[PDB]
Short mmCIF file of N, CA and C in Angstrom, two decimals:
data_model
loop_
_atom_site.label_atom_id
_atom_site.label_comp_id
_atom_site.label_asym_id
_atom_site.label_seq_id
_atom_site.Cartn_x
_atom_site.Cartn_y
_atom_site.Cartn_z
N UNK M 1 31.85 -45.20 39.83
CA UNK M 1 32.59 -44.25 38.90
C UNK M 1 32.04 -42.65 39.51
N UNK M 2 32.27 -42.03 39.76
CA UNK M 2 31.68 -40.46 39.89
C UNK M 2 30.74 -40.08 40.47
N UNK M 3 29.81 -38.89 40.69
CA UNK M 3 28.96 -38.75 41.60
C UNK M 3 28.31 -37.47 40.81
N UNK M 4 27.46 -37.74 40.19
CA UNK M 4 26.47 -36.15 39.42
C UNK M 4 25.30 -35.78 40.09
N UNK M 5 25.90 -35.72 41.32
CA UNK M 5 24.35 -34.48 41.83
C UNK M 5 24.83 -33.60 41.96
N UNK M 6 23.68 -32.30 41.71
CA UNK M 6 23.98 -31.22 41.55
C UNK M 6 23.41 -30.30 42.72
N UNK M 7 24.42 -29.22 43.25
CA UNK M 7 24.33 -28.79 44.75
C UNK M 7 23.77 -27.30 44.62
N UNK M 8 23.33 -26.66 45.49
CA UNK M 8 22.57 -25.22 45.48
C UNK M 8 24.30 -24.46 46.09
N UNK M 9 24.28 -23.70 45.45
CA UNK M 9 25.75 -22.79 46.04
C UNK M 9 25.72 -21.26 45.70
N UNK M 10 25.98 -20.17 45.96
CA UNK M 10 25.86 -19.00 45.72
C UNK M 10 27.54 -18.52 45.44
N UNK M 11 27.47 -18.31 44.31
CA UNK M 11 29.13 -17.85 43.93
C UNK M 11 29.53 -16.36 44.40
N UNK M 12 29.74 -16.08 45.60
CA UNK M 12 30.22 -14.64 46.18
C UNK M 12 31.74 -14.35 45.45
N UNK M 13 32.25 -13.62 44.86
CA UNK M 13 33.44 -13.64 44.38
C UNK M 13 33.87 -12.59 44.81
N UNK M 14 34.05 -12.11 46.10
CA UNK M 14 34.66 -11.15 47.40
C UNK M 14 35.96 -11.78 47.93
N UNK M 15 36.71 -10.65 47.88
CA UNK M 15 38.22 -10.85 48.81
C UNK M 15 38.83 -9.59 48.99
N UNK M 16 38.01 -9.31 50.81
CA UNK M 16 38.51 -8.40 51.86
C UNK M 16 39.44 -9.15 52.84
N UNK M 17 40.38 -9.40 52.45
CA UNK M 17 41.02 -10.08 53.51
C UNK M 17 42.64 -10.36 53.60
N UNK M 18 43.55 -10.56 54.30
CA UNK M 18 45.03 -10.89 54.39
C UNK M 18 44.84 -11.95 53.51
N UNK M 19 46.25 -11.99 52.49
CA UNK M 19 46.37 -12.85 51.40
C UNK M 19 47.12 -14.16 51.59
N UNK M 20 47.37 -13.96 53.20
CA UNK M 20 48.15 -15.52 53.96
C UNK M 20 46.54 -16.10 54.17
N UNK M 21 45.32 -15.29 54.91
CA UNK M 21 44.00 -15.62 55.36
C UNK M 21 43.68 -16.56 54.22
N UNK M 22 43.73 -15.45 52.92
CA UNK M 22 43.07 -16.40 51.65
C UNK M 22 43.80 -17.81 51.22
N UNK M 23 45.03 -18.18 51.46
CA UNK M 23 45.39 -19.37 51.30
C UNK M 23 45.16 -20.24 52.41
N UNK M 24 44.72 -19.75 53.56
CA UNK M 24 44.52 -20.49 54.52
C UNK M 24 42.78 -21.16 54.16
N UNK M 25 42.02 -20.15 53.65
CA UNK M 25 40.79 -20.19 53.43
C UNK M 25 40.66 -21.80 52.10
N UNK M 26 41.10 -20.78 51.07
CA UNK M 26 40.93 -22.02 50.37
C UNK M 26 41.88 -23.86 49.99
N UNK M 27 42.85 -23.29 50.79
CA UNK M 27 43.04 -24.66 51.40
C UNK M 27 42.11 -25.27 52.07
N UNK M 28 41.69 -24.81 53.45
CA UNK M 28 40.42 -25.38 54.27
C UNK M 28 39.47 -25.94 52.94
N UNK M 29 39.11 -25.38 52.15
CA UNK M 29 37.58 -25.67 51.53
C UNK M 29 38.32 -26.83 50.59
N UNK M 30 39.55 -26.99 50.46
CA UNK M 30 40.55 -28.34 49.67
C UNK M 30 40.43 -29.13 50.56
N UNK M 31 40.74 -28.91 51.56
CA UNK M 31 40.09 -30.15 53.16
C UNK M 31 38.50 -30.66 53.79
N UNK M 32 37.69 -29.38 52.60
CA UNK M 32 36.45 -29.68 52.75
C UNK M 32 35.46 -30.91 51.47
N UNK M 33 35.98 -32.19 51.80
CA UNK M 33 35.63 -33.18 50.16
C UNK M 33 34.90 -34.19 50.55
N UNK M 34 34.39 -34.65 49.71
CA UNK M 34 33.31 -36.09 49.37
C UNK M 34 33.89 -36.99 49.48
N UNK M 35 35.50 -37.10 49.02
CA UNK M 35 35.99 -38.48 49.16
C UNK M 35 37.28 -38.43 49.72
N UNK M 36 37.95 -38.87 50.20
CA UNK M 36 39.51 -39.16 50.74
C UNK M 36 40.66 -39.08 49.43
N UNK M 37 40.24 -39.48 48.62
CA UNK M 37 41.05 -39.69 47.37
C UNK M 37 41.49 -38.30 47.00
N UNK M 38 40.07 -37.61 46.99
CA UNK M 38 40.85 -36.47 46.30
C UNK M 38 40.63 -35.53 47.11
N UNK M 39 40.22 -35.71 48.83
CA UNK M 39 41.22 -35.52 49.81
C UNK M 39 42.78 -35.24 49.96
N UNK M 40 42.87 -36.41 49.40
CA UNK M 40 44.79 -36.43 49.93
C UNK M 40 45.38 -35.72 48.75
N UNK M 41 44.88 -35.83 47.61
CA UNK M 41 45.65 -35.07 46.22
C UNK M 41 45.41 -33.42 46.60
N UNK M 42 44.45 -33.12 47.15
CA UNK M 42 44.23 -31.35 47.25
C UNK M 42 44.65 -30.75 48.33
N UNK M 43 44.50 -32.02 49.33
CA UNK M 43 45.46 -31.71 50.57
C UNK M 43 46.94 -31.20 50.47
N UNK M 44 47.54 -32.05 49.75
CA UNK M 44 49.00 -31.50 49.61
C UNK M 44 49.62 -30.75 48.81
N UNK M 45 48.67 -30.63 47.78
CA UNK M 45 48.18 -29.80 46.31
C UNK M 45 48.24 -28.50 47.14
N UNK M 46 47.61 -28.40 47.47
CA UNK M 46 46.80 -26.75 48.61
C UNK M 46 48.02 -26.32 49.11
N UNK M 47 48.54 -27.02 50.00
CA UNK M 47 49.18 -26.45 51.25
C UNK M 47 50.62 -26.53 50.61
N UNK M 48 51.45 -27.04 49.41
CA UNK M 48 52.71 -26.82 48.85
C UNK M 48 52.43 -25.52 47.86
N UNK M 49 51.36 -25.57 46.71
CA UNK M 49 51.25 -24.75 45.76
C UNK M 49 50.81 -22.83 45.99
N UNK M 50 50.15 -22.87 47.21
CA UNK M 50 49.05 -21.93 47.46
C UNK M 50 50.41 -21.26 48.37
N UNK M 51 51.56 -21.11 48.52
CA UNK M 51 52.63 -20.94 48.84
C UNK M 51 53.46 -20.30 47.76
N UNK M 52 53.63 -20.53 46.91
CA UNK M 52 54.41 -20.34 45.55
C UNK M 52 53.25 -19.19 45.04
N UNK M 53 51.69 -19.37 44.77
CA UNK M 53 51.18 -18.79 43.73
C UNK M 53 50.79 -17.49 44.67
N UNK M 54 50.85 -16.66 43.43
CA UNK M 54 50.01 -15.39 43.62
C UNK M 54 48.57 -15.44 43.24
N UNK M 55 47.94 -14.22 43.60
CA UNK M 55 46.15 -14.39 44.05
C UNK M 55 45.95 -15.03 43.02
N UNK M 56 46.05 -14.28 41.44
CA UNK M 56 45.55 -14.84 40.01
C UNK M 56 45.59 -16.19 40.12
N UNK M 57 46.63 -16.60 40.04
CA UNK M 57 46.85 -18.31 40.03
C UNK M 57 45.85 -18.94 41.22
N UNK M 58 46.14 -18.26 42.47
CA UNK M 58 45.03 -18.84 43.70
C UNK M 58 43.07 -18.51 43.28
N UNK M 59 42.67 -17.75 42.40
CA UNK M 59 41.30 -17.62 41.92
C UNK M 59 41.35 -18.61 40.81
N UNK M 60 42.38 -19.10 40.07
CA UNK M 60 42.16 -20.10 39.06
C UNK M 60 42.11 -22.07 39.64
N UNK M 61 43.00 -21.43 41.00
CA UNK M 61 42.14 -22.87 42.25
C UNK M 61 40.35 -22.75 43.35
N UNK M 62 40.45 -21.69 43.10
CA UNK M 62 39.17 -20.97 43.39
C UNK M 62 38.30 -22.05 42.36
N UNK M 63 38.30 -21.88 41.03
CA UNK M 63 37.92 -22.43 40.19
C UNK M 63 37.75 -23.90 40.23
N UNK M 64 38.99 -24.11 40.74
CA UNK M 64 38.85 -26.13 41.00
C UNK M 64 38.40 -26.20 42.46
N UNK M 65 37.72 -25.67 43.07
CA UNK M 65 37.44 -25.64 44.56
C UNK M 65 35.61 -26.36 44.28
N UNK M 66 35.14 -24.92 43.30
CA UNK M 66 33.91 -24.99 42.75
C UNK M 66 33.70 -26.25 41.60
N UNK M 67 34.79 -27.54 41.66
CA UNK M 67 34.78 -28.89 41.11
C UNK M 67 34.01 -30.02 41.31
N UNK M 68 33.76 -30.83 41.28
CA UNK M 68 33.46 -32.00 42.06
C UNK M 68 34.58 -33.08 42.21
N UNK M 69 34.45 -33.36 43.52
CA UNK M 69 35.49 -34.62 43.59
C UNK M 69 36.02 -35.66 42.41
N UNK M 70 35.43 -36.37 42.04
CA UNK M 70 35.54 -37.65 41.22
C UNK M 70 36.13 -36.98 39.77
N UNK M 71 35.46 -35.88 39.76
CA UNK M 71 36.22 -34.86 38.23
C UNK M 71 37.33 -34.39 38.58
N UNK M 72 37.66 -33.76 39.36
CA UNK M 72 38.80 -33.07 39.87
C UNK M 72 39.81 -34.50 39.52
N UNK M 73 39.50 -35.54 40.49
CA UNK M 73 40.18 -36.79 40.47
C UNK M 73 40.64 -37.38 39.12
N UNK M 74 39.55 -37.56 38.29
CA UNK M 74 39.88 -38.48 36.85
C UNK M 74 41.21 -37.34 35.52
N UNK M 75 40.80 -35.82 36.10
CA UNK M 75 41.14 -35.37 35.35
C UNK M 75 42.82 -35.31 35.66
N UNK M 76 42.95 -35.27 37.02
CA UNK M 76 44.60 -35.54 38.04
C UNK M 76 44.85 -36.80 37.22
N UNK M 77 44.24 -37.78 37.02
CA UNK M 77 44.87 -38.93 36.75
C UNK M 77 44.75 -39.22 35.32
N UNK M 78 44.29 -38.26 34.90
CA UNK M 78 44.45 -38.85 33.06
C UNK M 78 42.88 -39.51 32.87
N UNK M 79 42.22 -40.42 33.20
CA UNK M 79 41.08 -40.28 33.17
C UNK M 79 39.70 -39.56 32.77
N UNK M 80 40.34 -39.59 31.24
CA UNK M 80 39.23 -38.54 30.70
C UNK M 80 38.23 -39.10 30.19
N UNK M 81 38.11 -40.96 29.82
CA UNK M 81 36.90 -41.55 29.24
C UNK M 81 35.90 -41.34 30.31
N UNK M 82 35.86 -41.14 31.69
CA UNK M 82 34.76 -41.49 32.63
C UNK M 82 34.14 -39.80 33.00
N UNK M 83 35.36 -38.25 33.13
CA UNK M 83 35.11 -37.41 33.30
C UNK M 83 35.90 -36.82 31.98
N UNK M 84 35.38 -36.45 30.85
CA UNK M 84 35.98 -35.65 30.10
C UNK M 84 36.26 -34.14 30.19
N UNK M 85 37.69 -33.33 29.34
CA UNK M 85 37.91 -32.28 29.95
C UNK M 85 37.71 -30.80 29.29
N UNK M 86 36.97 -30.47 30.42
CA UNK M 86 36.29 -29.21 29.92
C UNK M 86 36.83 -27.69 29.50
N UNK M 87 37.12 -26.94 28.50
CA UNK M 87 37.29 -25.39 27.97
C UNK M 87 38.38 -24.54 29.39
N UNK M 88 37.70 -24.34 30.40
CA UNK M 88 38.57 -23.99 31.61
C UNK M 88 39.91 -24.49 32.23
N UNK M 89 39.95 -25.87 32.14
CA UNK M 89 41.15 -27.06 32.12
C UNK M 89 41.83 -27.22 31.25
N UNK M 90 41.42 -27.46 30.27
CA UNK M 90 41.93 -27.44 28.60
C UNK M 90 43.16 -26.74 27.99
N UNK M 91 43.23 -25.71 28.63
CA UNK M 91 43.91 -24.33 28.52
C UNK M 91 44.61 -23.94 29.79
N UNK M 92 44.14 -24.94 30.71
CA UNK M 92 44.86 -23.81 31.78
C UNK M 92 46.57 -24.96 32.46
N UNK M 93 47.01 -23.69 33.16
CA UNK M 93 48.72 -24.81 33.66
C UNK M 93 48.75 -25.43 35.16
N UNK M 94 47.14 -25.02 35.40
CA UNK M 94 47.12 -25.38 37.68
C UNK M 94 46.38 -26.91 37.11
N UNK M 95 45.81 -27.33 35.63
CA UNK M 95 45.32 -28.47 35.76
C UNK M 95 46.54 -29.34 35.72
N UNK M 96 47.24 -29.05 34.73
CA UNK M 96 49.12 -29.94 34.32
C UNK M 96 49.57 -30.08 35.80
N UNK M 97 49.51 -28.69 36.51
CA UNK M 97 50.37 -28.72 37.83
C UNK M 97 49.89 -29.96 39.14
N UNK M 98 48.39 -29.92 38.26
CA UNK M 98 47.75 -30.99 39.70
C UNK M 98 47.97 -32.72 38.86
N UNK M 99 48.33 -32.51 37.48
CA UNK M 99 48.54 -34.00 36.66
C UNK M 99 49.86 -34.29 37.11
N UNK M 100 51.02 -33.77 37.13
CA UNK M 100 52.71 -33.38 37.56
C UNK M 100 52.74 -33.87 39.30
N UNK M 101 51.59 -32.94 40.10
CA UNK M 101 51.62 -33.21 41.46
C UNK M 101 51.40 -35.17 41.27
N UNK M 102 50.16 -35.93 40.61
CA UNK M 102 49.58 -36.74 40.77
C UNK M 102 50.79 -37.82 40.59
N UNK M 103 52.25 -37.46 39.82
CA UNK M 103 52.57 -38.43 39.29
C UNK M 103 53.74 -38.67 40.51
N UNK M 104 53.78 -37.41 41.19
CA UNK M 104 54.81 -37.20 42.35
C UNK M 104 53.95 -38.23 43.79
N UNK M 105 53.55 -36.87 44.35
CA UNK M 105 52.85 -36.93 45.45
C UNK M 105 53.94 -37.61 46.81
N UNK M 106 54.14 -39.05 46.76
CA UNK M 106 54.54 -39.29 48.00
C UNK M 106 56.03 -39.96 47.33
N UNK M 107 56.51 -39.34 46.16
CA UNK M 107 57.98 -39.55 45.79
C UNK M 107 58.28 -37.88 44.96
N UNK M 108 59.17 -37.41 45.61
CA UNK M 108 59.83 -36.23 45.10
C UNK M 108 61.20 -36.63 44.66
N UNK M 109 61.93 -35.38 44.11
CA UNK M 109 63.20 -35.62 43.15
C UNK M 109 63.16 -36.40 42.08
#
């Protein structure tokens, strides 16, 4: 249940690129993952939603790429017992999109 290991990262909030290349970047970092469970979840989610979403929504998605594998997976599966839901996701539409994705994934219509 979870992997609470803190990592060394530099939060460089800069965008000087084509918006199609930014979608490719965020979908790429979405397919860089610690576990295959969150990998399959965010790979299908990113490839689908980043096509329809504006850069503002993509920046909320950037905030999701800063989060840990198992934490993302528990909020999507509604296992808030193991990983409690933070403020940034408590009022977020993107979180609810990820939950509404999790129920479907391999089942459309």
